[PDB]
Structure formats: C-alpha cells, structure tokens
Design a protein around this nucleic acid. Sequence first.
RNA 1: UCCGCCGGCACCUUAUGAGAAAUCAAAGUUUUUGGGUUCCGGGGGGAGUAUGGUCGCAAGGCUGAAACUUAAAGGAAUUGAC
Lengths: 82, 202, 129, 220, 119, 68, 98
Amino acid sequence: MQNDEGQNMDLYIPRKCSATNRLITSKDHASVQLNVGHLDESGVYTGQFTTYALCGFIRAQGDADSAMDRLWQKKKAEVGQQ
Amino acid sequence: RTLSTKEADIQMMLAAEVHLGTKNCDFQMERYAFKRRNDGIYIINLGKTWEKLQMAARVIVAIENPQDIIVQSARPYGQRAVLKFAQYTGAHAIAGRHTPGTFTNQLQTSYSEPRLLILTDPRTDHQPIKEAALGNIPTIAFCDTDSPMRYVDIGIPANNKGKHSIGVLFWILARMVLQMRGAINQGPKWDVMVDLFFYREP
Amino acid sequence: VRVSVLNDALKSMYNAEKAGKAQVELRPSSKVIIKFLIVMQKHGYIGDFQYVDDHRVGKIVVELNGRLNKCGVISPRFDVGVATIEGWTARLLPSRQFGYIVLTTSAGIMDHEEARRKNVGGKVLGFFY
Amino acid sequence: KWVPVTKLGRLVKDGKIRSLEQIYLHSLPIKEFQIIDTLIGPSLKDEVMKIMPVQKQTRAGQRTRFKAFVVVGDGNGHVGLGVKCSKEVATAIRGGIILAKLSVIPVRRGYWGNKIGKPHTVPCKVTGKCGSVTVRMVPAPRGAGIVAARVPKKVLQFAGIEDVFTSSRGSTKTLGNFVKATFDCLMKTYGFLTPDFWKETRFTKSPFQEYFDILAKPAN
Amino acid sequence: GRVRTKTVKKSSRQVIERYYSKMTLDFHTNKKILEEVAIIPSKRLRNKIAGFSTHLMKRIQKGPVRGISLKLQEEERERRMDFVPEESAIKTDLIEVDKETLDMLSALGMSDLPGVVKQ
Amino acid sequence: VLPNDVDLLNPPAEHEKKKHKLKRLVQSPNSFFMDVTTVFSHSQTVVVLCQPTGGRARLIEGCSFRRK
Amino acid sequence: TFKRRNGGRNKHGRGHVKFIRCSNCGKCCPKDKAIKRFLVRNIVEQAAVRDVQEACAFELYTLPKLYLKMQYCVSCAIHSKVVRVRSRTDRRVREPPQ
RNA sequence: UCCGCCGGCACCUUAUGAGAAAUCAAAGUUUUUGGGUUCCGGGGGGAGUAUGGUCGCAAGGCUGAAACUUAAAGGAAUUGAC
Ligand SMILES: [K+]
Ligand SMILES: [K+]
Ligand SMILES: [Mg+2]
Ligand SMILES: [Mg+2]
Ligand SMILES: [Mg+2]
Ligand SMILES: [Mg+2]
Ligand SMILES: [Mg+2]
Ligand SMILES: [Mg+2]
Ligand SMILES: [Zn+2]
C-alpha cells in the first residue's frame, strides 16, 4: 500500500461491505451502495444521508434486508434520526 | 383523541387487511411476522411495516432525479397503483411484462439504467430483480410472509396480494415521499383519495 | 470421536466467518483454545469472546469482526526450532508481511514473531491471517 | 463517430470521469469500448494469444468457426482478456480486441520484502481456477523474473508484474482455461483483505449521483 | 391458404394507426384511400392491404386490438379509470380483527383505536 | 430466527424452553419433584399414586400433587 | 452416466425386495420397480349395458365392476404404451397425468 | 387435530460451495492444501492368465507374476447422421 517513504502504491481503496466487511471488487455488479436520507424536526429531507454498501455475496444470500435493518437501527440512534 | 401519523396509517392498513399474510412464512420473513393463529395464517406486525415504509421513503427522497426510480408490477392488481405512485412522486412506471435485456442490452430501444427499483412482489417480479443484480441497482419490494428475499435490499412486510392492500401501501408510500420533500403538509391526511390506487376491473 | 478440540473450535470459526455471522459458539472449551483466541484477539482478528461455565467443559461465544481470512490447526503438532520457523512461514502464510503461526513453547503459547524475539522453539498449534 | 448510449459513456465523453479507478471504486459495469480507449487508450497494447478453429457437424459438412484469444494491458496494473468466435479470422480478432478492453481489471501489486522502489510482485499468494486448470502465484524477490509458462507470462507482463513464482495443475494445454485461470487470480489481488485495508471505509457519491443534473438533461 | 404475410399485416396496421379517421368499413372506399395516402407498388398488394385493413376496422369497432395504437381511443380509457366513487371503499370505522390481531396491536400500545373491534 | 437476529449468550427464555435439555447453553433437566412423600416426575417405580411410563409417570386423579 | 436418482426403482433402507411376475410376459421384476396400474371398470362394456339392462330379470340391480391390478415389467409397459419415454426434464415429474 | 424436542428411511428448492462435467446439502468446509484411522489405484492389453503356496470331496476360492505387445483405451458433455 504505502512505500517505505510513505507514498501510496495502490490504484484505489475498494469499499468494504457494511455488513460482512468484505472487499467489493470492480466486477461485483451485484453490490449496491444505498443512501438513507436525514430528516429535520418537521420531517423534511435536509440533504444529509448515511451511506451503506452491500456486497453481492450478502445480497445473493437474501440477508441484505436484515443486515440493512440492523445497521439503520443503530446508526439512526447515533445521528439523532428517529 | 387525536391519532398520531403512525396510528392513523396502521388503522388504515388494518382496514385493507395489510396484516394478513400467507399460510407459509419464509425463514427471512419470520423477523417481521408477529404470531400465527390456529387458522395457520401469519399476521404481519404492522408496527414494523410502518417503520420499513419510513426507511424506504428516506431512500426515495435521497434520489436527486425521481426519473431514475422505476416502479413496476406484474400482477394486474398492482398495475394501477404503480401508475398513480409514479404520477405523484415523479417516478417512472412500467406496468405489464418486463422485457428481458432492459437493464443489460444497451442497443435495444427500451434500455434503461435506474438508480432505484421498486417492485410489488419479488416472487412475480423475479425477472427484474434477477436482472437488477447485474447493474448495481438497489431494489425495494413489498414482501409477503412467503416472499423470497434474494437480491432485496429493503423488504416491506405487507400483504402484496389483495387489491386494497397494494393500493394502500403505495398510497402511504407516495404520501411519505411527498411529505419528506415538503411538497405537502405533514400528518396522516392527503388531499388525494386512496381509491385512485385500487384496481379498476373492466 | 473428538480428537482435536482446537480443530473443531477453529473450523467452526472459519465456517462462521465465511458465512458472515457475527457470533459463533465453540464447544467444548479448553485452556489451549482460550490462549489461541487471545493471540488472535491481541492482533485484532477477533472481537470480544465470552466463556460460559456449564460445570462440564464450558463453552465460548466469539464475536467476529470480518477481519479473519482463515484459521486452522496443523496436525500432527510438529516440532519447530527457531531456525526452522522461516520455512514454516513460507508455507502457511500468504506473505512475509502479515499472518501468524501459533506455537506452543515452554514459555507459553505465542505467535512465531514473539518466538523469534524470545528465541524459543516448540510445536505448531495452528495459524491465522 | 461515437454516440454514447450509457450513462458512463456520456460522462466519459463529457469528461467528468477521467480515471478507471473512479469506475472500479463503485463496481460499475463497462459496456462500451470507447470508454476504455478514452481513459487508458494510448497506453494499451493488444496481442493475439491464439487462433482456435472450432467445428460444428452439419448435413452438408462441418461449419468451421475461428475463435480468437486477445489480451490487452498497459503494463502498469491494468489487463484485460477477450475471446470471440467468428466466421472470419479478421472479424474474430477485431471483436476479441473489443471484448478484452471491456473486461479490463485493476491488478494490485506489492513488495516481496522491503518496500523499496515501485511494486514488482503480487501482494499475497493468489490462486485462480477455470475448468481443471489451477494457477498459483507466490510473491517473488526482485529480479527473480516471471517464473511461468508462456501463456501466464504474457498476461503478467501486460499486467505490470515483474517478478513472481507460479505453479500450475490440470490441463494447461487447454489454452482457453489456462489464460482465463491466470486472469482469474489477477482479479483476486484486490479481493484479499489484508491488514492495511482494515481502515473503515469512507464512502463517496457515485458518478451517477454526483452528476445527476448532467445525466438528467438529454444529449443532442 | 389465405394467410396474410407480414408485408400485408404490417402495412395495414400502420395505415390504421395514423389514418383511422379516414378509413371506413367499405373495402371499395378503403382501397381508394390507400392510393391517396400510400405508395403500393402493385394492385394485388393494394387489394390485400385494403381488405385486411377493412377487417381490422371491424375488429376495432367491437373492441381494442393488439398491434394498433389509436391515441384518441387511449384517452377515453384513461378518463374512465380516473373516475372513482365519492365514498371510499376503506371504512376506518367498524374494523373486524381477530384475537391474534388485537394482541398484535397491544404490543404496539395501540389497543385504543376506535375502529378495531373483535369479531 | 436468523443467526444475526439472535444473541447466543442471552437467548429468549421461551426459545431455551423448547430446546433439547442437552443442547441449551447450560444443561438443565426437564424433571422435578412433587409432594402428595416426594415423588419424582419421571419415576420408574410404582408408588397407587404414580404409574411409571415411557416418560412422566401417570399420576392419579384423586390425590393432588404440589410441585417443589 | 446415472439416469435416475432412484435407480429406476423405489427402494430405501432395505436390501432385498421379492419380485413379482409381469402380467403380460411373466418376467420377474422387483415389486418396487414394476409399473402398477389398478384398473376398475364395469364387468359389462358400455356397448352392451343397454341390452343387458333391458334383459335384466330384477327390478333393481347394479352391474358389478371388474377390479384388476396389473403389474408390468419395463419392456411391456413401454411397448404397451402404459408409459412413454419422456424428456430429461419431464422424467422427474412424479404426479400422475390428467 | 395443533405446537415442539430427540432418533431413523427419504424427498423437494437453492449456491454463498464443490466438480471434467453428469451431478452432490455432501461427493461442501482443499494450492487460503494437515480432525483420527483402515483398505485400496498408478496408460491400454497380456491377465485374474502362468507358476509356487494355501483352503475345498469337486466345482473352485484366496494369494498372484513375467516375457511380450500397444498410442491410445477410457470418463462427461456438444452438434450431426442413423
Ligand atoms: K418403476
Ligand atoms: K423427523
Ligand atoms: Mg445409456
Ligand atoms: Mg434401517
Ligand atoms: Mg442385494
Ligand atoms: Mg438439489
Ligand atoms: Mg490435501
Ligand atoms: Mg496399468
Ligand atoms: Zn413383461
């Protein structure tokens, strides 16, 4: 990754699945990146969102729905969304 | 007394039998089912159904261009709701049969590249769901108790069979998307009538 | 019959990690398994694991963090002197930059990097990376 | 000329996207070879691996079609493999070149020992399988060269790999599977989660989301 | 046999799509319209197209067809669907629920809803 | 329940109730003693207060038993 | 190449099954492998019911039925068209036809 | 009749797996190669033959070669022709 001097030696840093932590390769066309919008006190979209990345492996297993639900149930309690 | 937005929607969903599931429950839908009665029919927890509707609405509003959202149904009962849902939310509705190669064949006329996909029933809409997994297209689907969860990112636990259930679900979802945009006033009421979403037989 | 409790413990973790599970139960438990886990935990390959006392052998629940590629035992437990550690690493590890071979030495259970620092040999228990 | 029909084609045609890594990050499929010619076009170099005639038995005779294996790569971490079958040798080669570009992948490179100079070998042990053919790649010290057969060696050279040890099992004489197996392990170089990738991911907007307004407006 | 080929069928549908108003139910009148609004190289081909188009006109009178898209006809169908009764089919009051359903609402703390009533 | 929707260390009390006695997180017998003179729920001996069977001993309707 | 998961018969968790004799040719065939058909029909053909009924000597009488259980070997079942050769996909369908 | 637990003969769907494929919920957890242990194979023939030993009333069983010969034999699947 980083040379002895410090310069980066990687073309890019692949994303990691938010549920399984697996790397997402350039040909993983079943992987999807999802955005969940943030609301205000009134309940109107404020232009802010939280991003989630899912690999094709977990989505093919059918566990994406459960994984997304658990991740959102935790994230919303941290950013004040409810 | 005054009913909150969640209570009013749950009351509306009860009248439409949105909570009545199939006699069989998929192992990945058990987390949404509440209890099974002696009749063998599973009862969907409407409390969780409303929460998933809110989560789906948050994803929809995050789409800058509504035209990138495609909502479609295969069964006739949902062909009316999808058209009305796209009318108010600005999405792109495709009612009828999905043409294979829509999302993969770049040289045919019907080629499209949606950012989000909405479906009424994964079991009947298997073709678009299967084809959406070749283009990094996230999918939202209304899933019944016996609905497969493969390649489904957000599954809304609801009865996607009855004509009333399908119409109410899209009516509520359309209202939530507009409310989160500030286009319409908050609350459980909407100037649009739900009957516009119900299936109109010949 | 159960021959190597360590193999069952590591095999269960490896299968669970590939399936994407967050927790996995190891039964039976042993002080060799616990010390093996501690080595993995110190290098940030597993999260927090909890030992349950059942008055017979106990049980362990291990929290997974998705960083573990593979973990397995080496059977039989061959003797490995300090001079022969280099050969084993060239065989079992992906590269010369990460991955640890767990050895049981007279100074205790430790990874091969620690064994070189203490200049102590022993026997191979397993590996992970 | 080129009239893009996909979202990436317009962005690449417009110039919003200027690197393949920005596409690889979001794992977006590439269907138009003009995109590859616009980003790493001048640095690419195609080479025909083999012409394989295949025959189909017919009432009048045997239908002979020609199958061409083409490998492309800039020699700096990008390589592609394309195979097309056609009734003419020239037509097969031209189509194979197009297919090779569409399958270009990023190849991760590392250091055998000390991180001195540019990366020269694979970062870890990687194996690829196609049919019965399995190709293994082990990191090798600088100057060791590419210790591999002709078919893997050609692919590795186009991928920018300078030194690596290789071993093979299975029917390597099946060139189609031998080259594909070599290409299979190269794409796995970015799939292995090393400790340096343990850092939490920092997501960024996809090109479609970033340039929604440009894509929304029809192109005329 | 007397099966019309794609040339006859395809041409007939196109004529009806953009000249439905001009077309009539009479073959003799229709074949004169084709000469005015189309270039048919041969007389025999023109007669076949006129006859099949006249057959399609009879089909349209009784109901819609598959391969012909009449824009004016489509608009009529849209208006009928948009019509809905003033009374909603979903009754918020007098909601029939089962014992399990009532317990499901109790877990949510919504056992005080007006409409919900046991069967 | 899916593996990731359940906690192995703190399973629901109802879930452990229906699990096999030997497969619970901690082994627990399903038997118990009762008064009537303590009688084992799965007694293998004739007490006629209880009649041994393949499982729990068949108790007599007349007398009333209190679990302990 | 293995053509069927069941091996052409219906035997699980047992070693030997006594054979039966084909109703057509008498060939020995294991009972679990033989094609079995239970034919129930009137003892009088439909072409003669009217004549027999008119000649009945009783005011009320129900014509008895003829029950015959037929057990065929594979060769006779195919030749007699009791069963037909099906495509690879259709071989797995075990439900009786319409 | 309904719910569940243990054990057994099986079946159905599915790939995140495996395989040359047929196919397999094991024939999976294998070049990211190691839970324990027994038997057993090394191109096709000659050949389960010759010989020696051993068992059997016999029929034969068990054990078991070489000379020499040969560039294929064979497995799965595809298109034709029949
Ligand atoms: K049979
Ligand atoms: K059972
Ligand atoms: Mg055969
Ligand atoms: Mg048995
Ligand atoms: Mg036998
Ligand atoms: Mg199967
Ligand atoms: Mg091995
Ligand atoms: Mg041999
Ligand atoms: Zn027979």
